[PDB]
Structure 1
Amino acid sequence: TVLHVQEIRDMTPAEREAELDDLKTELLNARAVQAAGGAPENPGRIKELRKAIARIKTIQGEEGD
């Protein structure tokens, strides 16, 4: 969603990795808030984050990093 394939391909290798760590962290924090039974959730993102990370990982392999 918020993150599109073009944007990803437009990132330098270093940017994708920095973007990767960033996404992984939001996810981890979502899973933390979920572990605490936290309700200020937005279930749609926890799902988007995973796809985003899969996209960046797919793009990284494609471009050769």
Structure 2
Amino acid sequence: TVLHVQEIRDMTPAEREAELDDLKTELLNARAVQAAGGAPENPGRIKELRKAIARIKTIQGEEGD
């Protein structure tokens, strides 16, 4: 959602990898918050993070990195 495909294609092979290691981390910091019986969660995003990263990896494929 917050991250649309178009926006991903309007990135540079660098921006993608950067945006990538950024999501990967927001992901980790959610799994952490959840691993600690944390309730400040919002299941609607820890799901998106995965998807987001999916797309990004999907684009990296198409664009040839």
TM-score (norm: length of structure 1): 0.99
The Cα RMSD (Å) is 0.3
**Unpaired runs of 5+ in structure 1?**
none
What percentage of residue pairs aligned between the two structures are identical?
A: 100
Runs (4+) of structure 1 exceeding 4 A deviation are none
Q: Shift in Å at residue 15 of structure 1?
A: 0.2
Unaligned runs of 5+ in 2: none
Q: CA deviation at 1:48?
A: 0.2
Count the aligned residue pairs: 65
Report the alpha carbon displacement of residue 4 of structure 1 after superposing the two structures with TM. Answer: 0.1
Deviation at 1:20, TM superposition (A): 0.2
Q: Offset of 1:57 from its aligned partner?
A: 0.1
Q: Report how far residue 49 of structure 1 moved.
A: 0.2
